[PDB]
Design an enzyme around this catalytic site. Sequence first.
Site, mmCIF file in Angstrom:
data_model
loop_
_atom_site.group_PDB
_atom_site.id
_atom_site.type_symbol
_atom_site.label_atom_id
_atom_site.label_comp_id
_atom_site.label_asym_id
_atom_site.label_seq_id
_atom_site.Cartn_x
_atom_site.Cartn_y
_atom_site.Cartn_z
ATOM 1 N N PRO A 366 43.104 22.458 34.586
ATOM 2 C CG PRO A 366 43.947 25.069 34.705
ATOM 3 C CD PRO A 366 43.137 23.941 33.665
ATOM 4 N N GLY A 369 38.918 24.100 37.874
ATOM 5 C CA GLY A 369 38.871 25.212 36.868
ATOM 6 C C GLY A 369 37.515 25.343 36.149
ATOM 7 C CD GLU A 495 39.115 7.585 30.065
ATOM 8 O OE1 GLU A 495 38.496 6.702 30.495
ATOM 9 O OE2 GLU A 495 40.360 7.145 29.041
#
Lengths: 579, 579
Positions: A366, A369, A495
């Site tokens: 999430p 998160g 990434e």
Amino acid sequence: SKLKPFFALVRRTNPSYGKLAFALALSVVTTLVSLLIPLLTKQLVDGFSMSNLSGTQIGLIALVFFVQAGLSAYATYALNYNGQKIISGLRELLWKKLIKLPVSYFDTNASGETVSRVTNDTMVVKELITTHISGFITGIISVIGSLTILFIMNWKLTLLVLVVVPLAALILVPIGRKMFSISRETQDETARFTGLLNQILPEIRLVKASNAEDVEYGRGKMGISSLFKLGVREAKVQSLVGPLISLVLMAALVAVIGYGGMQVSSGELTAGALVAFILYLFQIIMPMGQITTFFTQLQKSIGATERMIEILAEEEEDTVTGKQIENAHLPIQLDRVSFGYKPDQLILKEVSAVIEAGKVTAIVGPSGGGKTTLFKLLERFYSPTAGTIRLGDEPVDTYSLESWREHIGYVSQESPLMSGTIRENISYGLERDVTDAEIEKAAEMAYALNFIKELPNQFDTEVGERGIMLSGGQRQRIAIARALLRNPSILMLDEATSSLDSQSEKSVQQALEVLMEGRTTIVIAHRLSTVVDADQLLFVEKGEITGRGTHHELMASHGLYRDFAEQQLKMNCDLENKA
Amino acid sequence: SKLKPFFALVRRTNPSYGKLAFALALSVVTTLVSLLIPLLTKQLVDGFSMSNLSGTQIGLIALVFFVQAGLSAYATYALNYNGQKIISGLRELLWKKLIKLPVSYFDTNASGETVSRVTNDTMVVKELITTHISGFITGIISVIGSLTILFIMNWKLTLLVLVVVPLAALILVPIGRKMFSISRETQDETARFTGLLNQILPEIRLVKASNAEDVEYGRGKMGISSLFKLGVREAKVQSLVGPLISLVLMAALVAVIGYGGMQVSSGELTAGALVAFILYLFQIIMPMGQITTFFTQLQKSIGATERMIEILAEEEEDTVTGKQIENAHLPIQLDRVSFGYKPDQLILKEVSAVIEAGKVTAIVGPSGGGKTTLFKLLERFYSPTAGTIRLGDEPVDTYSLESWREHIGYVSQESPLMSGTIRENISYGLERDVTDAEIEKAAEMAYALNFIKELPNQFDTEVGERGIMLSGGQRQRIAIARALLRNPSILMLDEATSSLDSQSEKSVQQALEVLMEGRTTIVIAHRLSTVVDADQLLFVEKGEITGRGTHHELMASHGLYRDFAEQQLKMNCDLENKA
């Protein structure tokens, strides 16, 4: 009390005290020589009865002027030159500290604020050292010296100045404070009105469409009108303040100079004693201006010396004690690890994992998160709140942070490049030797060489803010080549976050595989579809983690936990999951 | 020459010339009264032989001081008060112009730059009117008046000042120009170094990972060192400049006052004539300071008056001539329409379309492909380069832009709200009457009422920058209610650009349908999948358009033209097209 930290700070730079003391002594001598000049003019003017004009008296005034200027040039150079040494030493200390402060420090404090401090506090301190201390001492000596000389030639005319100057100041000061308060209020209302106008203008699109022409004219007109009302209130103040300042100053001057003349004209004084009196009045008013400035400067100075000392006392990162790593690709265990910025909120707790030799593990979960904490824990960007990170069967805090950062490699999307050459970027920070024949043997791999060879120069472009702009794929390919030149045993990959273009992305994916082959790799990302090939995915539960299987196992026996992110994807599309 | 546009501009505000002329006359009278004061002090001081001290002479000096201050207060109030009227009139003219400049003007020129002009140019002009013209005249009268009075009492001592003052200035000026050049160069190098430090600090993430500690320390150290080298070069200048300024000033003062004393001491002059001489010297040096400032101000003033006149001469939008629309939902034809910002590049050409009563037509195509031009042409945000827009069978340029903008409605994503009440936003700009019982009969429709009733107040929140922050869906629902209160026959929709969250989006889609029912609707968007239900889609070919069918026909017999956008979508996902 407050001068003990400033002094200590100045001593940190191992300054030359003899040279500062001698410069201050020269300034004091320059001021005392400046008290001869009006006595020599009085002697010249008093001696002009029957117009003898002894050439030695007008020549001696010139010798005293060139001597005052010669010593003032020397003192002024010495003070500035040592202040420039002191400030240079301060900045070198502050910069060597900043570069070693843990990456936590810049997470809590703004980089720009730190730069602002190291560039302004040192300046303030410089200004205090070079100008304000000497200015203050010389002013006090000039003021008390001039008044003492005046009282010893005519005490009636200085008694008058010691009533006229304080009673003129006791009026001008409050009237000036009151004036400035009105100038601030009109500045603020000007600002408010410009703000209001600004806010209307980019929305002209609707104003036009909605027929709001008279409506937006009228709201602007109320701003013109409030500015005009404050402008009339400023006019009614400036109209009393201006005349009153001029009335006071000229009444003070007329009173002092008229009583000077009314002493010379009665015979109670000489023409040359009046000349000396005027010449000293200028040596009272101006340094009195100077001394007043010293105190504000002193306050600011204290605050600066408080911030700089704060930085130069802070903790720095212990990068260079521990063991040296051998066979670094071995299993990274986490077992009962935990973290938080403060023990008030444990951002991650009860975590255990294994990360496996030559495989990939992907931190995906999430948005907001807390998942970025596990990544920063694994790269040692943060110490655990007492739970073990362990390599093979040795606690990872055993190895030196240098010997750690050497066997790690690191790459990200959204990265800029270091201002410098392209060969300097493709080999950044590594203290091993490199050669033309091998630096491009790392660059052909990310397809960087056959891109770089098409630029105006094959080894430089002044990359970053000075040179030409580069696209994200080109910047990623330059980063991927640097990691191939280090040949790390473990790889940390960031990434993507925020948003990015898909242009040339499949060729960038083929560039990325090169680096991660046959070495342990840890990746962090924002979507599951980018990570379908990974040998273990880690889902994040706002303090705890699960998943601990392939992407397909998340798609097969995880369910609701895939749905708590996959639903937000399926509001847009199935994201190539095809299920 | 240059004063004819300023004057004309000032005349645009219908100013009161009598009051400005009288204020200037009072300033001139105030300066002439200020030339009596030193003659009255000379008469007092010369009359002090045998110390008679006629009380009428020291009382008459006070009467002349209170008279000078009373007239100076009146002139200063009058000048400021009329300047405040003139500037208010200017701003009202400039604002009434800006609000009527075509939406093209803000497309070419920056809104902030326009605000900056209307807030600064008027100020400059004010400053020139209130202070600088009167200051300049009074200074010239004070300087030439004082010198003429000095030459008529002692021509030898003014001949000396008319050599000492220009020869002192001929030294201080070049030495000051040279000084300031070094201060600018050290400012620039300080700036360069802070910039360099700033640029390193946010990338500390890599610096740490790459072991670039000594590398980034050394590049910072070279900045410390270049700053130190320029600091030593400034020290070697400031050390000559400081002593030389003080040497010159004191040599000038000693020469003037010593020759004053050497005239009084020989009998060639009186004690009171020396007193008058000093008192006038202050009335020479300060207004000479004043006059010099007039010219820079005059230059800036000219530039301001050039920009403001530029705005106030520009073209404004002819919003109120033409017919009145009846039965406005009829077919909008485009037939051989064209556009470009200049005929050098025809942004859209040879276009024809029909847009159909109670249906939808969707402008969807390549990013940066110019598609926004057709939307701005249809809403009359832009005039065609000689090709017809036609409603039913009447050219659309027949109807008044008011009677057009009334039968159009308009909504966008990425919109802010007008600073004002929520009832004021839900009924913005419409001059028809409204009532509590119907304004919420428009707001229950977008689900706006049952959201607004949960806020701390059911009709206000100071929405925008002052009040609480609102999410995009809430802002869209507030916009959709305004259009239901207008009940337009035709609707212009800007559905999305840039990026947006999908949170609550299906409830927002159900809110949007309300408005577009049973009225002609034109939509612009960035993706095909948002537009699958549309009765005609228009694809854009960087100057021309095709498609002219359902979304499915684009998916069936268009091919390569769908692929020229669908491929960039399929790099991410099939976007619910499922084909």
